[PDB]
């Protein structure tokens, strides 16, 4: 129902990976068109898409001031994660590794 946040976001902590391979992301939003939904993307190191998916999965931010815990599942080896919309996206490198 939301409309997509167009503005910036800021990483409020250090990344973490869980059990599943998902990755911990809290951010707080910069913007003043809340409430709006997080644009989230994955991409490799040339900045062409990738094979990511949301798991919190309606992420929005509902007001300014508040942080917002989001829960990603990236693909697996190197991937950017991209929080927000072009240039000033929060980017965040992680590598996901499954089971030997």
């Given amino acids: 129902?939301?409309?997509?946040?167009?503005?910036?976001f800021?990483?409020?902590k250090e990344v973490s990976?869980?059990?599943?391979?998902?990755?911990?992301?809290?951010?707080?939003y910069k913007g003043e068109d809340a409430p709006?939904?997080?644009?989230?993307?994955?991409?490799d190191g040339q900045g062409k898409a990738h094979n990511g998916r949301l798991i919190t999965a309606?992420?929005?931010?509902?007001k300014k001031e508040e942080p917002v815990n989001?829960?990603?599942?990236?693909?697996?080896?190197?991937?950017?994660?991209v929080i927000g919309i072009g240039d000033k996206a929060l980017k965040i490198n992680w590598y996901?590794?499954?089971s030997s």
Avoid: D, W
């Avoid at 990976?17 to 707080?28: A, F, R």
């Avoid at 309606?58 to 509902?62: A, I």
């Fill in 1 to 8: 129902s939301y409309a997509m946040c167009l503005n910036t």
């Fill in 10 to 12: 800021v990483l409020k």
């Fill in 17 to 28: 990976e869980t059990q599943h391979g998902t990755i911990l992301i809290k951010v707080e």
């Fill in 36 to 43: 709006c939904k997080i644009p989230f993307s994955t991409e």
């Fill in 58 to 62: 309606n992420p929005v931010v509902t």
């Fill in 70 to 81: 989001i829960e990603a599942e990236p693909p697996f080896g190197e991937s950017n994660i």
């Fill in 96 to 98: 996901r590794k499954g």
